[PDB]
Amino acid sequence: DVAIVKEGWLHKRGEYIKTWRPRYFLLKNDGTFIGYKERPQDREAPLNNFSVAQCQLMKTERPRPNTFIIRCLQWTTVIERTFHVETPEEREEWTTAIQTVADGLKKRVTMNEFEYLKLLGKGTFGKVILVKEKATGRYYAMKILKKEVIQNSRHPFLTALKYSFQTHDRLCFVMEYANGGELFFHLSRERVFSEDRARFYGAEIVSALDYLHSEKNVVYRDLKLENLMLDKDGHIKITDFGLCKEGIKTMKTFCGTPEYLAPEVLEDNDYGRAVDWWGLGVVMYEMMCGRLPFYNQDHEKLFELILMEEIRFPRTLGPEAKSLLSGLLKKDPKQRLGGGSEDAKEIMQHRFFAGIVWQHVYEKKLSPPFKPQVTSETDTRYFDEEFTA
Numbered sequence: 611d612v613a614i615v616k617e618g619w620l621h622k623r624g625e626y627i628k629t630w631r632p633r634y635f636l637l638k639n640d641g642t643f644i645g646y647k648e649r650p651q652d653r654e655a656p657l658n659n660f661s662v663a664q665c666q667l668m669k670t671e672r673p674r675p676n677t678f679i680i681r682c683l684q685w686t687t688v689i690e691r692t693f694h695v696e697t698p699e700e701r702e703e704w705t706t707a708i709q710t711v712a713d714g715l716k717k718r719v720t721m722n723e724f725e726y727l728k729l730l731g732k733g734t735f736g737k738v739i740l741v742k743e744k745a746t747g748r749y750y751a752m753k754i755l756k757k758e759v760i761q762n763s764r765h766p767f768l769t770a771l772k773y774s775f776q777t778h779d780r781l782c783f784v785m786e787y788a789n790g791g792e793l794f795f796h797l798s799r800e801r802v803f804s805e806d807r808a809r810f811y812g813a814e815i816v817s818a819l820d821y822l823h824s825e826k827n828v829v830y831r832d833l834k835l836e837n838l839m840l841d842k843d844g845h846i847k848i849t850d851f852g853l854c855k856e857g858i859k860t861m862k863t864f865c866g867t868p869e870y871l872a873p874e875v876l877e878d879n880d881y882g883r884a885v886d887w888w889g890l891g892v893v894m895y896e897m898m899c900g901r902l903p904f905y906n907q908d909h910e911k912l913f914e915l916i917l918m919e920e921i922r923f924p925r926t927l928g929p930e931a932k933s934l935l936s937g938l939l940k941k942d943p944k945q946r947l948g949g950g951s952e953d954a955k956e957i958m959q960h961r962f963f964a965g966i967v968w969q970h971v972y973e974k975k976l977s978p979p980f981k982p983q984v985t986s987e988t989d990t991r992y993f994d995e996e997f998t999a
């Protein structure tokens with residue numbers, strides 16, 4: 611039943627390097643809108659990252675004429691993809707096709723109950739906020755999004771969406787906020803993790819990535835050290851505090867920092883589940899080596915570093931760790947560990963994760979190698995000022 615409704619060359623604006631790139635886009639009746647560097651001769655499981663389901667289409671003349679924007683709410687994050695064609699007629703042909711398929715797929719808690727503590731981050735369509743529920747004393751991160759531009763599922767290593775409510779102009783997502791401290795703060799304080807400790811953190815991330823891939827059919831895409839926290843027990847919590855942010859202008863405009871970006875994501879080429887395995891490679895590389903894989907100031911260099919410079923490893927690192935990182939950090943997704951049809955299983959069966967019972971990881975049977983210094987989830991120790999040191 612999966613068929614191509616409309617295809618052709620578009621000009622997609624880079625998602626991280628905001629330049630225009632010619633990409634051949636395939637629109638399918640399942641709602642997938644994928645772009646490729648070259649016309650593909652041709653995983654098969656549809657990724658919701660490219661889905662046009664429940665998306666509003668906007669025709670703009672800024673920043674470039676004949677521009678149409680696809681805006682989608684994915685879980686709790688508003689994403690935008692900006693496209694450009696040569697003639698207005700072409701743009702109408704595309705928007706009508708997309709809107710048709712988007713419709714073809716269509717087949718009391720308030721703000722006063724929380725206390726504002728800290729601004730975690732701000733973006734184009736809203737802000738993220740650290741709150742403390744007055745009643746329970748629990749700590750949460752609240753995503754306040756603009757309503758204009760716009761619970762049943764759970765996993766032990768993902769920041770759970772506790773509840774969602776909306777005001778007259780704002781949509782709010784209340785998520786669990788772990789109080790075991792930022793993982794980069796722990797890695798910064800202890801310099802390097804032992805292979806055993808990194809295996810623990812690594813194993814829990816793999817489980818959550820498998821969940822997002824096989825169950826939710828989604829790519830996390832932003833796996834980095836900054837997006838990892840520990841709970842009071844020292845178990846990993848991958849966060850969901852991301853926001854759409856406009857780029858910043860050496861004279862070029864970039865969206866975020868590239869050091870963790872998979873090569874196929876930098877080039878705005880086709881990407882899949884293999885992206886998170888790169889992300890896992892970067893994270894695990896830093897835990898066991900105490901530094902980022904590629905590092906250079908000039909972004910022109912940093913891009914090349916990720917794109918062409920191949921990773922080298924410390925001699926004090928075990929061969930089992932080498933094999934894992936080497937495969938995880940293959941520049942080509944199809945050669946990358948976990949980039950096959952087996953996905954996560956390709957990694958769970960790796961020598962580095964030998965002896966690890968993967969049902970035990972999911973059920974948190976594994977005893978954490980590190981226990982945060984908190985009495986309870988309400989212990990505000992890792993929010994305090996000595997968090998500086």
Ligand SMILES: *CCC(=O)Nc1cccc(C(=O)NC2CCN(Cc3ccc(-c4nc5cc[nH]c(=O)c5cc4-c4ccccc4)cc3)CC2)c1
Nearest residue numbers: 625685687689690763768769826830831832848849850854
């Ligand atoms: C305005 C700029 C812009 O939009 N840039 C841009 C362009 C193109 C793509 C992106 C983009 O993908 N941006 C973000 C989107 C959010 N990603 C993080 C993330 C991924 C997945 C989840 C998530 N999704 C779920 C879906 C369905 N059921 C679930 O249970 C889900 C659970 C999660 C989840 C994952 C981890 C922790 C907690 C929940 C959430 C966030 C990063 C890239 C941007």
